[PDB]
């Protein structure tokens, strides 16, 4: 979560970036204090 949501430089939208993720536990409660999101929407699954 730290080099995805806390990267120093992001890409331009025309040359957008894609990154593989594997072999890791998805415990996002670590972003509760880290990162306030104005938008967060999920498709095909319930957030709960």
């Amino acid at each position: 979560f730290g080099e995805v949501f806390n990267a120093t430089r992001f890409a331009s939208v025309y040359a957008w970036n894609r990154k593989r993720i594997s072999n890791c536990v998805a415990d996002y409660s670590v972003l509760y204090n880290s990162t306030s999101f104005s938008t967060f929407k999920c498709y095909g699954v319930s957030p709960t």
Partner: protein
């Protein structure tokens, strides 16, 4: 239809949050407000 109805068991809940967190005051939401602070029922009748 609010002008033509009569209401049973009316309660008002009040609090203050950050602007980013307002989207979490809704049924079936995740995030720290909706997990540790204030939770709405899945079957909710009323207004936010």
């Amino acid at each position: 239809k609010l002008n033509d109805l009569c209401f049973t068991n009316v309660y008002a809940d009040s609090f203050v949050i950050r602007g980013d967190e307002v989207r979490q005051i809704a049924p079936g939401q995740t995030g720290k407000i909706a997990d540790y602070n204030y939770k709405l029922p899945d079957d909710f009748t009323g207004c936010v």
